[PDB]
Amino acid sequence: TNGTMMQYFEWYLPNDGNHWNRLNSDASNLKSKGITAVWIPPAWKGASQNDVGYGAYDLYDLGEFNQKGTVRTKYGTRSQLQAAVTSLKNNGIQVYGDVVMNHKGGADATEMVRAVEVNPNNRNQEVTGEYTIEAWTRFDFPGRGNTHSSFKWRWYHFDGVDWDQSRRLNNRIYKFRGHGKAWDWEVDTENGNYDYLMYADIDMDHPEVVNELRNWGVWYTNTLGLDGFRIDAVKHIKYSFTRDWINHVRSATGKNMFAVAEFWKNDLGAIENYLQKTNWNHSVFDVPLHYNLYNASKSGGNYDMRNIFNGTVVQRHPSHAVTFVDNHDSQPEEALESFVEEWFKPLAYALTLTREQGYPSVFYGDYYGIPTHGVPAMRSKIDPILEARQKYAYGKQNDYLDHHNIIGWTREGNTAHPNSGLATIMSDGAGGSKWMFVGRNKAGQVWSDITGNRTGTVTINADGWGNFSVNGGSVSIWVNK
Ligand SMILES: OC[C@H]1O[C@H](O[C@H]2[C@H](O)[C@@H](O)[C@@H](O[C@H]3[C@H](O)[C@@H](O)[C@@H](O[C@H]4[C@H](O)[C@@H](O)[C@@H](O[C@H]5[C@H](O)[C@@H](O)[C@@H](O[C@H]6[C@H](O)[C@@H](O)[C@@H](O)O[C@@H]6CO)O[C@@H]5CO)O[C@@H]4CO)O[C@@H]3CO)O[C@@H]2CO)[C@H](O)[C@@H](O)[C@@H]1O
Numbered sequence: 001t002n003g004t005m006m007q008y009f010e011w012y013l014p015n016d017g018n019h020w021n022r023l024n025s026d027a028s029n030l031k032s033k034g035i036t037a038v039w040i041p042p043a044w045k046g047a048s049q050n051d052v053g054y055g056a057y058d059l060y061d062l063g064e065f066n067q068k069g070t071v072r073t074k075y076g077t078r079s080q081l082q083a084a085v086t087s088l089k090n091n092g093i094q095v096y097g098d099v100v101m102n103h104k105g106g107a108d109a110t111e112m113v114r115a116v117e118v119n120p121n122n123r124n125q126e127v128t129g130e131y132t133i134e135a136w137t138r139f140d141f142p143g144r145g146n147t148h149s150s151f152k153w154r155w156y157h158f159d160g161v162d163w164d165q166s167r168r169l170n171n172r173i174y175k176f177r178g179h180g181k182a183w184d185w186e187v188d189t190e191n192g193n194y195d196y197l198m199y200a201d202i203d204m205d206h207p208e209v210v211n212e213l214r215n216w217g218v219w220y221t222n223t224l225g226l227d228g229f230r231i232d233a234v235k236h237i238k239y240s241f242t243r244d245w246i247n248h249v250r251s252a253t254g255k256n257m258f259a260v261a262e263f264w265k266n267d268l269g270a271i272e273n274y275l276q277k278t279n280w281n282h283s284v285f286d287v288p289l290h291y292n293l294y295n296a297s298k299s300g301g302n303y304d305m306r307n308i309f310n311g312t313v314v315q316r317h318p319s320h321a322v323t324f325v326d327n328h329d330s331q332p333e334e335a336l337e338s339f340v341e342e343w344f345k346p347l348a349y350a351l352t353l354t355r356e357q358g359y360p361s362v363f364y365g366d367y368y369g370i371p372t373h374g375v376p377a378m379r380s381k382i383d384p385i386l387e388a389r390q391k392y393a394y395g396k397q398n399d400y401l402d403h404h405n406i407i408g409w410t411r412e413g414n415t416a417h418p419n420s421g422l423a424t425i426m427s428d429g430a431g432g433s434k435w436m437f438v439g440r441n442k443a444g445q446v447w448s449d450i451t452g453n454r455t456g457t458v459t460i461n462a463d464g465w466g467n468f469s470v471n472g473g474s475v476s477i478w479v480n481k
Pocket residue numbers: 047048049054055068069104105106107108109136161162163197198199200329335
């Protein structure tokens with residue numbers, strides 16, 4: 001019953017064009033482990049074959065056309081992708097496709113465009129007069145032609161770029177000039193106006209652009225049979241556009257598509273504003289929680305575990321939070337590196353997987369490892385927690401975040417799941433024990449640690465209380481197994 005999604009990729013995967021095939025054959029295994037939804041990496045053609053996908057070149061080329069020196073994407077061909085999707089569907093797993101609509105990179109050619117430079121620290125401040133630059137804004141898709149779509153992109157479909165091919169200057173941001181040209185609003189306010197991020201910034205003020213992206217959203221959904229989306233860089237995209245794009249896609253397909261947006265800012269207030277402005281029609285990744293987990297793992301036991309959920313989306317708006325431990329941007333060497341230390345990772349996953357609030361996600365990099373950076377596969381430690389979520393994490397939740405090192409919570413279970421109920425206890429410091437209430441109807445039951453970290457048993461007393469124990473810097477999940 002409890003749903004769990006998985007980000008099925010990491011940044012440093014090999015460019016072997018065999019990832020779709022890997023996902024294909026891993027489908028039954030994932031379902032058996034408790035995974036109910038899979039977020040697949042960008043499926044379209046990037047600026048090159050080894051692009052992770054965020055250097056989005058052609059959203060209609062899913063590894064089908066000869067463009068950018070390759071037919072397949074880094075992950076494989078369109079047919080292999082479709083085969084992977086079918087495999088997931090046949091195993092009862094929902095599919096969420098990534099969505100990049102903030103920018104387009106790898107333009108086919110440059111164009112001469114009128115523009116003014118703006119302050120990188122305050123994009124609302126123009127720092128030069130108007131002049132002509134050579135920008136990478138032309139997209140004709142020579143390898144695809146008009147197959148699937150005849151829409152061609154030009155400078156007027158964009159708000160700006162960060163590179164003038166004729167002068168090649170560093171640390172510059174160019175805002176295009178022209179009828180109705182201006183940074184979009186509303187967007188995040190860091191740097192004054194955070195509409196611009198990288199590559200050629202799409203202008204959400206252009207009617208043709210809005211219409212085209214909405215149409216692509218539907219094509220994309222119907223072509224792959226997607227059940228939902230993971231929306232990239234939303235703090236840089238006009239808020240109302242994203243809100244209405246999701247509504248349009250849901251209406252056009254007659255499907256209540258699930259959607260999780262990546263609003264990357266360690267600021268609950270900013271995220272709440274985004275949620276209100278998009279009318280709460282979709283979820284968001286709990287970025288603040290990720291940072292709390294990261295900081296806790298770096299504090300050597302001095303993090304006040306009683307505050308692990310403070311300032312988080314899952315605490316404030318549980319229904320709209322997708323909880324994650326790490327992702328492709330927080331992993332080693334990447335842009336937002338803030339990787340939760342290995343010793344704390346099991347505690348982190350227990351915090352997201354065994355509590356009643358939020359929609360938890362498992363990171364491919366954590367589960368299977370990141371060979372290129374010495375990160376071992378942790379599925380052996382994650383699997384027991386996934387089993388706890390699938391069979392035991394049900395019913396009323398009782399919180400015990402009452403100690404700076406040792407915290408815990410219990411689930412009283414429900415009749416829908418046999419023997420359900422659990423008692424999670426963890427410590428970022430010295431080990432110990434804690435008395436916790438699991439329910440009077442559990443009196444006499446002999447519980448054991450599903451993680452295997454503790455080998456003893458805990459007998460629930462006649463009053464429904466158990467004295468649960470945990471080792472130092474570890475997590476134990478006691479259940480009636
Ligand atoms: O032989 C090699 C190469 O040749 C050809 O490539 C040419 C290409 O076809 C042609 O379009 C042009 O490329 C232009 C490009 O079109 C322009 O848009 C421009 O691109 C630069 C972009 O504007 C910059 O913002 C910068 O992008 C950075 C971001 O700023 C970073 O933040 C980072 O973003 C990533 C982030 O870290 C991740 O967390 C995730 O969000 O993903 C993000 C995206 O990856 O990285 C990006 C990428 O570095 O730099 C862009 C340039 O790399 O300028 C380009 C020209 O400099 O010219 C190409 C060279 O002739 C051929 O087509 C290729 O197939 C072939 O590989």
